Amino acid sequence: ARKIPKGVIHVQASFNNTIVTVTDVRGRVVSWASAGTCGFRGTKRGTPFAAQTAAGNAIRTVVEQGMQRAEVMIKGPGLGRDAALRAIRRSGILLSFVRDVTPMPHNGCRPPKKRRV
RNA sequence: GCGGUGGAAACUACCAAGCUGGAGUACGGUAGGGGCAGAGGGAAUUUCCGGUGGAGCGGUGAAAUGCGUAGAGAUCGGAAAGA
Numbered sequence: 001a002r003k004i005p006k007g008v009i010h011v012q013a014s015f016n017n018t019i020v021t022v023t024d025v026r027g028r029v030v031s032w033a034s035a036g037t038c039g040f041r042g043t044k045r046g047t048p049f050a051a052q053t054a055a056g057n058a059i060r061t062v063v064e065q066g067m068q069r070a071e072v073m074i075k076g077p078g079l080g081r082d083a084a085l086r087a088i089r090r091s092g093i094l095l096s097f098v099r100d101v102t103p104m105p106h107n108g109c110r111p112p113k114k115r116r117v
Numbered sequence: 118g119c120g121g122u123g124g125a126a127a128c129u130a131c132c133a134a135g136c137u138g139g140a141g142u143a144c145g146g147u148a149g150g151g152g153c154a155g156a157g158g159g160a161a162u163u164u165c166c167g168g169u170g171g172a173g174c175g176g177u178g179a180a181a182u183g184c185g186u187a188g189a190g191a192u193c194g195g196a197a198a199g200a
């Protein structure tokens with residue numbers, strides 16, 4: 001739909017799922033792919049493999065718009081933080097910068113209590 | 118045991134003067150999340166207002182309630198607030 005030569009890839013990795021969004025430097029969203037939209041449900045939705053197919057599935061659409069260089073943003077403690085990165089590499093798209101944006105509060109809102117499990 | 122009387126003068130007690138090592142005062146330093154009061158600061162989060170986008174998000178041992186086509190989550194820009 002839009003052919004943008006350079007932009008950014010946001011990958012949020014949580015413990016139950018990982019979102020991979022494709023955007024451009026103007027701060028605008030083009031197309032996204034989630035581990036859940038790939039036909040995965042809750043348990044499997046956390047594994048690095050679903051993050052793999054998620055990243056691959058977004059980059060399908062990003063090469064279809066004909067884009068070349070990109071920055072990678074990784075947010076969150078989950079597993080896909082490593083796995084997704086591999087996909088970004090093997091999908092044959094030039095890797096500019098890979099940053100870790102995981103929000104670190106400098107103090108603040110008191111987190112939920114400890115699960116006694 | 119109590120009372121009277123004659124002696125002794127070390128220890129406690131009393132009376133008079135002394136002495137610093139105890140306790141303080143002045144002086145000069147120095148470390149400190151000590152206390153009270155008044156200024157300022159940033160992350161993060163939540164909600165609200167927009168632009169993109171367009172099906173799931175969220176969550177568990179595995180699920181479901183819940184939130185979502187009345188456009189969620191994601192992402193960029195703005196405000197506001199408290200801790």
Ligand SMILES: [Mg+2]
Binds near residue numbers: 015016
């Ligand atoms: Mg889990």
Ligand SMILES: [Mg+2]
């Ligand atoms: Mg006698």
Ligand SMILES: [Mg+2]
């Ligand atoms: Mg005497």
Ligand SMILES: [Mg+2]
């Ligand atoms: Mg005296």
Ligand SMILES: [Mg+2]
């Ligand atoms: Mg105060």
Ligand SMILES: [Mg+2]
């Ligand atoms: Mg600020």
Ligand SMILES: [Mg+2]
């Ligand atoms: Mg649209």
Ligand SMILES: [Mg+2]
């Ligand atoms: Mg419902």
Ligand SMILES: [Mg+2]
Binds near residue numbers: 187
């Ligand atoms: Mg409404």
Ligand SMILES: [Mg+2]
């Ligand atoms: Mg619209």
Ligand SMILES: [Mg+2]
């Ligand atoms: Mg949102």
Ligand SMILES: [Mg+2]
């Ligand atoms: Mg404020």
